[PDB]
């Protein structure tokens, strides 16, 4: 799981 942002 990879999540980037806001």
């Amino acid at each position: 799981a990879v999540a980037a942002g806001a």
Side-chain angles (χ1 to χ4, degrees):
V2 182

